[PDB]
Amino acid sequence: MSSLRLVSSSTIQAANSQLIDLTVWDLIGLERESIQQGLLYHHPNQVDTPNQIQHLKHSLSSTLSFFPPFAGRLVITEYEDNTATCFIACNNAGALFVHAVAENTTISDILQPNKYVPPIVNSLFSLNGVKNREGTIQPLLVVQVTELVDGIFIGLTVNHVVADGKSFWLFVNSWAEISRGFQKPSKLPTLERWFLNDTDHPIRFSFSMKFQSGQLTTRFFHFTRENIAHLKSKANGEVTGNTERRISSLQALLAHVWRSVVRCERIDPQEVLYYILLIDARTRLIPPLEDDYFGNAGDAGVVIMKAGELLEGGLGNVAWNMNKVISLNSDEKIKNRYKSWLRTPQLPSMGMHTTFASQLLIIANSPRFNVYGNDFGWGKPLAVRSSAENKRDCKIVLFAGAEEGSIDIEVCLPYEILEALGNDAEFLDNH
Ligand SMILES: CC(C)(O)[C@H]1CC[C@](C)([C@H]2[C@H](O)C[C@@]3(C)[C@@H]4C[C@H](O[C@@H]5O[C@H](CO)[C@@H](O)[C@H](O)[C@H]5O)[C@H]5C(C)(C)[C@@H](O[C@@H]6OC[C@@H](O)[C@H](O)[C@H]6O)CC[C@@]56C[C@@]46CC[C@]23C)O1
């Protein structure tokens, strides 16, 4: 019979004071969840496991020297007028390293064949459910390494006020390099964060103030490079007037997934639908931020369409609308939205009351993040998984696929819609 237990929990400080001021993008995450993603590895041959665990521990400490925020803590000051400030103290209080053993549990137990994410996956991460503002006391980075019969799982819990998805995977890429023998990471973070004026920080903000919540389930779908290329051509072929074939591969796929989810739920064609993209500000500010700007730097772009138009209007029209919402996130709108936020600095509510699954769909992560380059010395990973802690939001999480140019999507929806999707030949997934 299989089981799961914790062997040890250890504080990891940076191998070798300063403060970081947080900007609007960072503060918005204070009352939300951590990023919880991890990497699954197969051990074809025998491995000296105590030596592997020790090597991950020491290479983690070496990497933290280059990313001191992950070894620090948040500092929150609450004021009588119900406002607050927040910053990161790089005080080297340390990350947390959790060593767990899943007896009689295997790779294939974790990757159930073309099925749903099994419950064991959520236990491969530590500090599940902890909101980011609890980083005043809790580590900003927790690493759980779980031993399996035929491999290991490396699961990270990262405070979303400190880092977005891009920065999460910058750190993982850099940790893998250090573990492989690199002296320094190949990409060094930019740690000073963005404000329109030096006088803005510390920003003084206020805290506080869903269909089938708690009942959602999670399933992965795989999209080959070919099927993606097929959808891009189709979408661009349907919008000829004014096109140099500028609908991207990702836009076409996301448009296709949106249509497929709505098709499978079978809803009134008068329903209004909201599709939440996160648009990176790094490349869009003038002057742009550094590519390796370490923090949050992205804004919701909300695509809105009637269900009837979404389906009856064709793939290219949906993808064209997405392309246009992305294009409106200009340097002007980023800066004006920032300025407008400073004058009503309220952390957001997570939005409307939803009465069906397709109503509000959140798109997270990106296929541009490097998942399969994370060789720590024992080979590339077999798969990427998240904690699947979320059972509240209808959500699509994007991952680079194992094959060149493919994409894995992790879909969190009611079970019956995920079943319809897996039986829909128009949904052009594979495996
Ligand atoms: C266009 C309309 C008609 O007005 C309206 C109708 C209403 C709505 C559908 C819009 C609101 O209008 C604003 C809206 C987007 C909310 C406020 C947030 O958006 C931020 O709102 C603040 C202001 O409060 C802006 O300044 C930021 O630019 C913006 O980003 C976001 C995030 C950032 C927390 C978001 O989380 C990221 O999901 C992507 C992942 O990749 C990341 O991991 C992850 O963090 C989850 C969704 C969520 C909660 C909601 C939900 C949907 C809302 C409620 O559109």
Residue numbers in the entry: 1 to 16, 23 to 215, 221 to 251, 253 to 443
Direct quotes from the study:
AmAT7-3 is discovered through a stepwise gene mining approach and characterized as the xylose C3′/C4′-O-acetyltransferse of astragaloside IV.
The variants A310G and A310W were found to catalyze specific C3′-O and C4′-O acetylation for astragaloside IV, respectively. MD simulations showed that the substrate binding is relatively stable in both AmAT7-3A310G and AmAT7-3A310W, with only one major conformation. For A310G, O3 was almost perpendicular (92.9°) to the plane where the C = O group is located, while O4 formed an angle of 47.8° with C = O plane. As a result, the O3- acetylation was kinetically favored over the O4- acetylation in AmAT7-3A310G, which was consistent with the biochemical experimental results. QM/MM calculations showed that the energy barrier of the first reaction step was 19.9 kcal/mol for the O3-acetylation and 30.0 kcal/mol for the O4-acetylation, respectively. The A310G variant catalyzed 5 to generate a single product with a conversion rate of 96.3%.
